From a paper:
To assess whether disruption of the Asp–Arg–Asn triad in [name] leads to a wet distal heme pocket, microcrystals of each variant in the Fe(III)–heme state were produced and subjected to RT-[name] crystallography using a high viscosity extruder sample delivery system at the SACLA XFEL beamline BL2 EH3. For all variants, well-defined electron density peaks were present in the distal heme pocket, consistent with the presence of resident H2O molecules. In the [name] variant, only one resident H2O is found, and in the R243A variant, four resident H2O molecules are observed, with three of these accommodated within the distal pocket and the fourth positioned in the space vacated by the Arg243 side chain. In the [name] variant, the single H-bonded distal pocket H2O molecule occupies the space left by the amino group of the Asn245 side chain but is positioned too far from Fe(III)–heme to initiate a bonding interaction. Thus, Fe(III)–heme in the [name] variant remains pentacoordinate, as in WT [name]. Notably, the H-bonded Asp–H2O does not have the same spatial stereochemistry as found for the Asp–H2O unit in DtpA (an A-type DyP possessing a wet distal heme pocket that uses the Asp–H2O unit to facilitate Compound I formation). Thus, the Asp–H2O arrangement in the [name] variant would not be expected to facilitate proton movement in Compound I formation. The [name] variant can be considered to have a “semi-dry” pocket, in which case, the effect of pKa on Fe(III)–H2O2 would be less and is evident inFigure 2, with the pKa only partially visualized above pH 4.5. The pH dependence of the [name] variant is closer to that of WT, but the data provide evidence of an acidic pKa of < 4. Thus, the D152A and D152A/[name] variants (fully wet) are almost fully populated at 76 and 93%, respectively, while the “semi-dry” [name] variant is 52% populated.
Numbering used by the authors:
A (entry chain A), B (entry chain C), E (entry chain B): 7 to 312
C (entry chain F): 8 to 313
D (entry chain D): 8 to 311
F (entry chain E): 8 to 312
The structure:
């Protein structure tokens, strides 16, 4: 088989997201680093096992792929598609490489990011760097549990990993990232019952609203999608709180993994453009997107044979 | 009889340092928050006990003290003293209020900082915000164990807490903060043996160099000071690594607590001005101070009384 | 096919709930069964990774006939009462079993509260037991309990239905019995006499040699080989329970097997005896007061209902 | 003098046992009392450091007179029944209290088994409750419970008898009530309405400001100031309990104080009300079915 | 007030006991090491906190004291006295220095022992080296819980630390060590009931036998001693199992601390010489002493000043 | 076929036992082998989940012929002595290996006591070592030890016998060597000089680039490719041991492989050298004083006795 990267990681309380662009003539340095990234992960992580749980998932953008490699391309790889809805806009921002670094402690993430960027100095320019921390009861910046309905085990593998539909790229995945800033003053102006009608789940107990109370423009109603054959279309999320108390910056760094970008893109279209039944996802009246990029995360053996 | 704030904290792997100035007319809002800060600490921290270990130490600058309170001044409270050495400078920067927030996780520090700054918006301006993380083996940004010779138990109480010498302020302490950025490039150019001659201890095993081979301009030699009676003068440190790999910012946020500022200021004078035997502390040839402030951290009952 | 969480990691707390379905309660019950996996996620996700909450849901032979209109699992029948010369294994009513396990009683109790909230008016409670395991895996008799359970691949082969009943693959069969002990009589035996009842050493949990182990010891009678001389295995998670006021000291027995015939062969040898043994000596200090049999279907069977 | 483990670390499991002493049981009881600290060590030591097992032993007003001759602790009396306009605090029988706490129910149950084994034939059980805390210190009403308890030095001064009753120094007074909740009615309230009953925000556990806090909120009525304007404090370790089958959802209340006067002033305000408040709004969703008062002596009193 | 060595330690699962003699002319090397040993403890231990729990207690024999120091002798310090009972003998064996090294892991003990013996090679001759391990439920080599009736908190300090009776040595303690080998074959030939009559406690539940059943020659009866007034004389023990399965060596390395040696030596006289009511301690019919030594463990400041 | 616990989680304590079978001891040994998995559960289950106790049982080449009739595992032979120009890999006697691992020394000790209790009078001890790993996975030379071990499916492929020897599938081959270090000489090197001996950075455990890594560094010599250009890998769990009184500072080496040919190729390059290197520089600070080879069968092979 092909061996996947660590897309299906165990639960982690800390994360670093790094997005860079490749400077002109930086290609060779980048290909050198990509062949060594799993070795750097083992070197930083092994001495802190079994509790460290350090991993790095490496992603490549559509334009970067054409600069790095000749030949066949993953079937779904394109630049993030901007959405200009009647009220809300999903922006596309630059990004050639993604490092999704996760662990039980921020210091491990930071040590592996230091070795990665040390190897890339002179070849890349930083676009975004976020240090994520999860709240102790899995809560996000809106005060709701975040992760509950992710798929697990076999269902997760089927949802996230490329298989026989794109055989040359089997064991790969597609990652969409969006950094959101929240308007917390507006959000805290709602009662708890009004907040629940935005999300579609109870705040304190995390039980889903009944089919008879759940609004058509609630976040959970719009991100719930069935395919033609009536199967659930699922993604795997590992969204993380971040920000700065001084600048009054309260955010959610969103990442979703899927076997095809079509599933993630159908969810984003319903959220930003709406449906017959809903103008837009009510979560967006308290959340502004400031970045948007799409990456292909290849099989581990693809990176190792560079 | 008077109950100290949590100056003598158990070991914590995360910290937030917040330094603010009080805007004109902000005094009353500030006094109201100071009387509630212990209540806010319990509200965020109690539900995560016993492993959260959340604490907040609140400090007040010399000029802020005169705007907030009439009556007696703590005996040792003055503005941080700038040090103009022939090569190295210890700069003085503005700060009226210090919040030293510590816990076993960054998310708890961040939740308490959010409640504090929520009460003060409109009354203060942020000067510095740092999110610190400790390495898994108590290492700092230079790769040395950091904290080894701090005093513990009764020796720590004697070294840090004001007593009979200033009876109205007993159970208080004095906090000096400096943010340092390191030249990691220059530091990693040294052999391990050359790094040991800068610090004064072995890197991997943290054994002190013997009295005959320890250089006179090593960090350990210069911060070792005896009083007139031949007593060792000690401080309590809780320095934290911080940074951003994208902006190449690798730092140490220094905080030191002492029963009198004269002990910390004797250490800073030896480091920046030198002695007959040493021009300056060699650690300063790889470390630049960008902030400097001095605060009195009163007994908890002093803050509760307002 | 995705099993329910039959093969769970070690748990120190459990709630057993046995209920009968009132006339006309069927539709409410079918609605709850389609939601029970989502209720497990709602209560459990925010307490991960340490909570380790799971629920295994079972259906009795007569309830199956009232709920579902197609094929029956091949081994599902009402518990068979065993009328021995001395000891009786009684059959008591039960339509639905909830086997709820976690690292803490409060999590089991929160999931039981949500389940029973959905069933109020549709079911009548028959049994509710709150179990606790001793810190060194000991039971109410003071012996280590679980030692010879199968693990890994052997456990899956022993417990999960496969090719022999393909429509119900990934299911299992659960036998429950509540036992009350005569602890006064038990504690009147010497430790050596207790060892001859169980078949293992009390302090060190070493199996008695084939030369000393009596024919009517618990371990001799629950050791059974199939036609090829292969060991027939069950998976147990028996839990102590009781009340010191009422002098109630119990063991709540649950055993899981791929076919009821394995557990029923073990009960026949215990209660009816063999050529070599009148009955299991453990029964001279243990009285069964309940007995029921349940089919625990594959998770996808419960999810795909109406 | 060495106190019993009144000031315990946080515990997630508890057994409450209340018994009466049968006639002629006195000597069996006095034998167990001299050995109960030994039994605590016997069951607990092998499960350190995580077990955190302790047992606090209390004696009622009537029982004291049957067991001991000489001076009585100054504040020891039978629980006082409160007959309010709407809500009633009942007085129920109890001679001995065992407050058993640990990180796991199985350790509580092991110590309870050895204690009741020693007392079989001398005592009648009145109450047995097995308590569990929710993983974020929440109680049966879904609020954080314990937040304003005193800690360290403040806790010692609030809870332990000192120079005012020198023969009984290092003792405390324990008040217990078992409450059953109407959870149906409680879950019918909005979160905002629940906050106005308790006097704290539900999700973040921040006290309501003095301008929005209702006068008949639980926190407003259990706030009492002394002559010098000091806070009068108690130490609580109230525990959820119940049965899902029988629809029984409860809080087993225990409060410790250096004098019963502090706890009894709080109960009078809750049940009788004041000029400003009819009664504590928490009592429109909580019914007391037991009430008892115990003196918890110093460890050395029990030993000698 | 004087700072004790870490005599009152938290529970530790591993230990190294080192006993050495000072070679002729080794005195100055030894005095140099003694002034550094607390700094070596911090150097090895700090980076492994909070779980390491590493400490070292340093003791000095009666004859060594006279070679190392001029001035006052601690009032209770004398050579261990041999006990020649009718059946059992307590031997006295040489030792000038004791290192009692404890931690949560053997590797920490070993790293500190390596640094100590590195400083002394050429100055000392090793007499005994023992690597101790406690069983997971505090059980010893005889299978009984060991430590239960040790004093804690304030009672422990009163029992172990020298006070105003010998003011120059306040915060010191007296350590007696004996290495015992067990006859395991003979011991395991006893029933649990017979083992309980030797120890004086129930094996599984660690409940003390009643005054009416506890034999007069049981270990617990003979090591229970009351002073001239009425009160219990206590010592603090941290005895550890040790052995070699190859050599058939199964041992208990006994260490007891007391404020005066008279308490420990009264316990030894009752065990070896017996009373009116008992010939000897029944534990001695399964345990042979092969070493016996007495040390004074001074206050930490005594060692630091020299 | 259910393997023994070769692929164990990380363990901080170990006991290694090597014994020879006395005349007439065969029957006692066969009895103990059929019971050893049940003794592991008896000592370990009560201490789960933190105990992580396991025992791996191995049998030497000569012992196999005394214990069992029928087929021999294809790769089982006596350890081959290497007499290199400077350094020697010695062979020492061994019929049975017990590789006992846990999170605490006391659990290893309890299981070794029950095993040796069953064998008293049937076996003679050759070697007994009590191992301890440093808290940050460091070894006796002060380097992280384990970093490049294979994990998951790559580990199973590297260690477990498959279709090449079908009657012995789920078995493995263990090579043991006890090493004593000259720590005085080692600690006389600068950190930079030590890195050039190992082939990795000491503090950060980053591999030296192919351009700086010397040809006689330990990592260069124990890196081996097959005909197919694929890496040949082993699974190691080498453990520090010593006695501070005796000045004994050691590494007890154990390596597991699907075939002995992989471990034997690594030992030949270390002790005999290559075109580019006289010998492994790690051997100028490490002396081998034991050497033995064992087959560790599938668990069901031992049970069906
Ligand atoms: C870049 C900033 C700094 C770094 C990375 C740093 C790092 C260290 C390190 C590695 C040690 C040795 C281990 C220990 O005992 O903790 C140490 C010791 C110490 N440092 Fe610093 N230090 C810094 C700044 C300061 C400053 C500004 C002061 C005083 C104002 C200071 C006072 C001390 C003292 C008192 C010790 C203990 C000396 C002894 O062994 O007795 N440090 N520092
Ligand atoms: C009072 C109720 C029971 C108690 C207290 C109890 C206790 C025990 C104990 C202490 C063991 C030995 C350790 C171990 O788990 O391996 C054991 C083993 C066993 N018990 Fe029971 N048991 C009970 C009832 C039952 C019942 C009703 C069954 C089956 C229908 C059962 C089946 C087994 C089996 C299969 C084993 C393992 C046998 C082997 O070594 O292969 N037990 N039980
Ligand atoms: C159904 C029974 C009870 C429930 C569920 C309950 C629940 C709570 C809650 C959630 C708090 C707020 C957070 C905290 O400080 O813990 C609280 C505070 C408190 N309760 Fe209660 N309580 C009950 C009965 C009682 C009784 C009977 C008393 C006194 C006799 C009492 C005295 C207090 C005190 C003193 C406070 C703290 C007030 C302050 O902030 O100073 N409670 N209780
Ligand atoms: C191989 C040697 C020894 C073994 C295996 C051993 C074992 C134990 C055990 C199992 C207990 C009961 C549980 C407890 O409270 O710790 C105990 C108690 C005790 N042991 Fe020993 N012991 C040994 C030698 C000694 C020596 C040589 C002395 C005194 C010089 C001693 C003094 C004590 C004392 C003072 C107690 C506490 C008794 C009480 O007050 O209840 N032991 N020992
Ligand atoms: C004498 C004591 C020994 C010590 C102290 C030692 C130490 C080390 C250390 C520190 C590493 C680096 C980290 C790692 O990947 O584990 C390593 C790697 C390794 N050692 Fe050794 N080793 C020893 C003997 C041996 C022996 C006898 C063999 C083989 C027969 C061997 C084969 C290996 C292999 C295969 C690797 C991984 C190579 C790679 O990176 O691909 N070692 N050893």
């Amino acid at each position: 088989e092909p061996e996947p990267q660590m897309v299906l990681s165990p639960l982690t309380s800390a994360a670093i997201f790094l997005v860079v662009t490749i400077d002109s003539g930086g290609e060779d340095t980048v290909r050198d680093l990509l062949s060594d990234v799993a070795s750097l992960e083992r070197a930083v992580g092994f001495r802190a096992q079994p509790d460290g749980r350090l991993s790095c998932v490496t992603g490549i953008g559509s334009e970067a792929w054409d600069r790095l490699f000749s030949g066949a391309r993953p079937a779904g790889l394109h630049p993030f598609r901007e959405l200009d809805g009647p009220v809300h806009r999903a922006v596309a921002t630059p990004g050639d490489l993604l490092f999704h670094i996760r662990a039980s402690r921020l210091d491990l993430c930071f040590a592996l990011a230091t070795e990665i960027m040390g190897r890339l100095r002179g070849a890349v320019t930083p676009q975004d760097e976020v240090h994520g921390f999860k709240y102790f009861d899995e809560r996000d910046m809106l005060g709701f549990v975040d992760g509950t309905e992710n798929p697990t085990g076999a269902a997760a593998r089927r949802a996230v990993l490329v298989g026989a539909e794109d055989p040359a790229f089997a064991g790969g995945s597609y990652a969409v990232v969006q950094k959101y800033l929240h308007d917390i003053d507006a959000w805290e102006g709602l009662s708890v019952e009004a907040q629940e009608r935005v999300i579609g789940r109870r705040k304190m107990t995390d039980v889903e609203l009944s089919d008879d109370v759940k609004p058509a423009d609630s976040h959970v109603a719009l991100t719930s999608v069935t395919g033609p054959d009536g199967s659930d279309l699922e993604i795997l999320r590992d969204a993380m709180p971040f920000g700065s108390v001084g600048r009054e910056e309260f955010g959610t760094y969103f990442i979703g993994y899927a076997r095809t970008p079509e599933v993630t893109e159908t969810m984003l279209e319903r959220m930003f453009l709406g449906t017959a039944s809903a103008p837009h996802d009510r979560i967006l009246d308290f959340s502004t997107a400031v970045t948007g990029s799409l990456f292909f995360t290849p099989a581990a053996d693809f990176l190792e044979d560079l």
